[PDB]
Write an enzyme that holds these catalytic residues in place. Structure first.
Site, mmCIF file in Angstrom:
data_model
loop_
_atom_site.group_PDB
_atom_site.id
_atom_site.type_symbol
_atom_site.label_atom_id
_atom_site.label_comp_id
_atom_site.label_asym_id
_atom_site.label_seq_id
_atom_site.Cartn_x
_atom_site.Cartn_y
_atom_site.Cartn_z
ATOM 1 N N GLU A 1 0.774 -1.158 -0.006
ATOM 2 C CA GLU A 1 -0.124 0.131 -0.054
ATOM 3 C C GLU A 1 0.714 1.260 -0.087
ATOM 4 O O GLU A 1 0.191 2.350 -0.297
ATOM 5 C CB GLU A 1 -0.861 0.156 1.149
ATOM 6 C CG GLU A 1 -1.920 -1.332 1.213
ATOM 7 C CD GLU A 1 -2.842 -1.066 0.128
ATOM 8 O OE1 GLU A 1 -2.968 0.061 -0.439
ATOM 9 O OE2 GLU A 1 -3.880 -1.682 0.035
ATOM 10 N N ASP B 1 -6.561 6.745 -4.853
ATOM 11 C CA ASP B 1 -5.948 5.352 -4.832
ATOM 12 C C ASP B 1 -5.928 4.847 -6.529
ATOM 13 O O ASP B 1 -6.044 5.557 -7.198
ATOM 14 C CB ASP B 1 -6.726 4.286 -3.971
ATOM 15 C CG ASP B 1 -8.024 3.830 -4.305
ATOM 16 O OD1 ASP B 1 -8.645 4.410 -5.485
ATOM 17 O OD2 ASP B 1 -8.651 3.169 -3.817
ATOM 18 N N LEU C 1 -8.898 4.098 2.860
ATOM 19 C CA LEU C 1 -9.848 4.545 2.053
ATOM 20 C C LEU C 1 -10.494 5.712 3.024
ATOM 21 O O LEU C 1 -11.206 5.408 3.878
ATOM 22 C CB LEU C 1 -10.913 3.380 1.435
ATOM 23 C CG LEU C 1 -12.014 4.263 0.605
ATOM 24 C CD1 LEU C 1 -11.568 4.909 -0.635
ATOM 25 C CD2 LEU C 1 -13.196 3.254 0.377
ATOM 26 N N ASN D 1 -7.256 -19.988 -10.490
ATOM 27 C CA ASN D 1 -8.682 -19.496 -10.582
ATOM 28 C C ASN D 1 -8.672 -18.009 -9.870
ATOM 29 O O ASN D 1 -9.317 -16.899 -10.297
ATOM 30 C CB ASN D 1 -9.567 -20.268 -9.635
ATOM 31 C CG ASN D 1 -11.056 -19.821 -9.551
ATOM 32 O OD1 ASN D 1 -11.547 -18.892 -8.534
ATOM 33 N ND2 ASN D 1 -11.796 -20.267 -10.510
ATOM 34 N N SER E 1 -12.498 -19.973 -5.557
ATOM 35 C CA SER E 1 -11.113 -20.097 -5.189
ATOM 36 C C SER E 1 -11.010 -20.204 -3.828
ATOM 37 O O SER E 1 -10.094 -21.052 -3.281
ATOM 38 C CB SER E 1 -10.640 -18.555 -5.065
ATOM 39 O OG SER E 1 -10.665 -18.078 -6.376
ATOM 40 N N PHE F 1 -8.194 -6.487 3.451
ATOM 41 C CA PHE F 1 -7.877 -5.032 3.550
ATOM 42 C C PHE F 1 -8.110 -4.252 2.414
ATOM 43 O O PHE F 1 -8.507 -3.333 2.228
ATOM 44 C CB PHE F 1 -6.537 -5.228 4.058
ATOM 45 C CG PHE F 1 -5.936 -3.532 4.276
ATOM 46 C CD1 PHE F 1 -5.368 -2.966 3.324
ATOM 47 C CD2 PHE F 1 -5.915 -3.169 5.698
ATOM 48 C CE1 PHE F 1 -4.955 -1.457 3.691
ATOM 49 C CE2 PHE F 1 -5.505 -2.171 6.002
ATOM 50 C CZ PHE F 1 -4.935 -1.252 4.933
#
Ligand SMILES: [Cl-]
Ligand SMILES: [Cl-]
Length: 162
Positions: free
Chosen positions: A11, A20, A32, A132, A117, A104
């Site tokens: 990040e 972002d 965010l 996948n 998945s 996250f």
């Protein structure tokens, strides 16, 4: 390596409001702020989050504080989620970090949406799950970060991050 250092690599850290990859107002370590297009709506959320008048800028400590809350909330959300919990419970410590990373970034709803998945991870079919996971908008949009997470699931080591 641990969840914190992993997410700090994925990040980055920014002390001023930024946009972002999706174009949303963010600050610190991937925190965010709002999906709204208004910079003012963003400053408002920021000040609400910090408890002071920030004028769009925060300190390292404040960034780290938001980051500690966010990882905590991420873990607690997984454990409260009927779909995620079983997967998380079944995994080793490295792979648990990989699912926390996804949550996250994309929220619990999003990850819970990777039905096939998740089933493959639970069954420990590593290579199949990696294939996948790559068929997703997530992988197409942020391929370098998705590859790192995927490799972590495939191998169960921190190699992609070293
Ligand atoms: Cl908050
Ligand atoms: Cl990327």
């Amino acid at each position: 390596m641990n969840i914190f250092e992993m997410l700090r690599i994925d990040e980055g850290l920014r002390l001023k409001i930024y946009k972002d990859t999706e174009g949303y107002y963010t600050i610190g370590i991937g925190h965010l702020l709002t999906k709204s297009p208004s910079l003012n709506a963003a400053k408002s959320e920021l000040d609400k989050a910090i408890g002071r008048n920030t004028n769009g800028v925060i300190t390292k400590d404040e960034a780290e504080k938001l980051f500690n809350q966010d990882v905590d909330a991420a873990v607690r959300g997984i454990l409260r989620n009927a779909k995620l919990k079983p997967v998380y419970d079944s995994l080793d410590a490295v792979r648990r970090a990989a699912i926390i990373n996804m949550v996250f970034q994309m929220g619990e709803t999003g990850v819970a949406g990777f039905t096939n998945s998740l089933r493959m991870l639970q069954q420990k079919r590593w290579d199949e799950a990696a294939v996948n996971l790559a068929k997703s908008r997530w992988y197409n949009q942020t391929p370098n970060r998705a590859k790192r997470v995927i490799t972590t699931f495939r191998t169960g080591t921190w190699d992609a991050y070293k």
